[PDB]
Copies of this chain bind each other. A is one copy, B any other.
Amino acid sequence: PDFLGHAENPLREEEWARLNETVIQVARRSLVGRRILDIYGPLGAGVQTVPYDEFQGVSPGAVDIVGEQETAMVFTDARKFKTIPIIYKDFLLHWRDIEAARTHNMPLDVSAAAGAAALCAQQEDELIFYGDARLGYEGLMTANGRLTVPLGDWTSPGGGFQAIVEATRKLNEQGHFGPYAVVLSPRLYSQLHRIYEKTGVLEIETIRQLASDGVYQSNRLRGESGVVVSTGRENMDLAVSMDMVAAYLGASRMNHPFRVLEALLLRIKHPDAICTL
């Protein structure tokens, strides 16, 4: 019979396979921060730690052949890797329904799961774009090397043109150049969605051709802020230990509790690539 219990896997192999498929689908649609930076390789949950620092840093020298003289480069400086967080949003499945699905119904419902993952992965991005004083992190607002531009995103028609252009100026001048990506607040994006501009075509065409890796909108970024980076690797890395998954709390009073587990840590290996408002 059922039985009751505590041996599951409350699902069976098929429904279990579904829940995983549903979660990563909805999570991936709600993740705006994995689309602006290409991911690191999976390290498994086996590693607790992701390497942390580079550059800062010195330019010169060559003569002919021997020495005269450098460097030894760097390392830079100290360690250790600040443990990749494990973030979770919890939800329960309620009593019998699952077992009603074992005979009566073919579709097993999702009380939360797609919603919780959507809530969790989003909050993950808030972790990415802001800083955390709580445990030892680099956000894209706290990394310094920001050389903060006198904002941009005016009302007057030039507006965001001058901004991103000014960004590229100092970014390039710091002695770091490459393909650029631009992240904006939705409110900024609409006010910057232009209207009109140069009389040839609109803002999307001019910015997307200027930054030229892409243009993206995040809801978790500060309303006033927006950030420009360089997508090139060995600059920033999005370090993922474990991806998004459905996990089991086990038997409880009576319930099946789940959590969604996501471990994402972003390291800034060259913090000359970051510019805020």
For A2, the chain B residues whose CB sits under 8 A away are: 45, 247
Does A126 sit within 8 A of B, measured CB to CB?
Answer: yes
0 or 1 for each of A88-117: is its CB under 8 Å from B? (1 = yes):
111111111101101110000001100110
Does A219 sit within 8 A of B, measured CB to CB?
Answer: yes
Q: Report if A247-B3 is in contact (Cβ < 8 Å); known contacts: A91-B71, A112-B73, A198-B196.
A: yes
- In the complex, the chain B residue whose C-beta lies closest to that of A173 is B186
A10 CB to closest chain B CB, in angstroms? 10
Beta-carbon contact of B245 and A249 below 8 Å = no
Which of B77, B202, B245 touches A4 (beta carbons < 8 Å)? B245
Q: How many copies does the complex hold?
A: 6
Does A75 sit within 8 A of B, measured CB to CB?
Answer: yes
Beta-carbon contact of B45 and A250 below 8 Å = no
A200 CB to closest chain B CB, in angstroms? 6
* Of A57-65, A145-153, A162-170, A232-240, the one touching chain B: A57-65
Beta-carbon contact of A48 and B89 below 8 Å = no
- In the complex, the chain B residue whose C-beta lies closest to that of A111 is B75
For A79, the chain B residues whose CB sits under 8 A away are: 48, 64-65, 82-83, 135
- In the complex, the chain B residue whose C-beta lies closest to that of A185 is B173
Which of B5, B85, B115, B134 touches A248 (beta carbons < 8 Å)? B5
Which of B134, B179, B250, B255 touches A254 (beta carbons < 8 Å)? B250
A228 CB to closest chain B CB, in angstroms? 14
